[PDB]
Design a protein around this ligand. Sequence first.
Ligand code: CL
Ligand code: CL
Ligand code: NA
Length: 130
Amino acid sequence: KVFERCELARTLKRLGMDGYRGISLANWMCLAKWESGFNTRATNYNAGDRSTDYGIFQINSRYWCNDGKTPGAVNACHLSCSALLQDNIADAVACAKRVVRDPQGIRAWVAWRNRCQNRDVRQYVQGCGV
Ligand SMILES: [Cl-]
Ligand SMILES: [Cl-]
Ligand code: NA
């Protein structure tokens, strides 16, 4: 599914993402935008280390979910990477919450640093009613 901006914004709020571990909803929107373009079925294979990024938040198979083909990987979210390709983002959100529970927080995604950190992220939620 390819979510529309405000539809996604309202969905994330309802799922308790606003201010989770100190991360504002606009930061999560900025992240989903640059990682997948709000697309839940986006997958990206990293030739360099044999891992794959899955879903709307582009969660990596080496640490967070199990796809069975990534060498020396773990499954911290205790999920099949398949769960991160659903139209229903409940599992993807629970896994994203797990990711930011680690010390790096939102910084775990390099994309956030490059395009969201120290920027005016208000634009991603303006007019959405959240
Ligand atoms: Cl699963
Ligand atoms: Cl599994
Ligand atoms: Na894994």
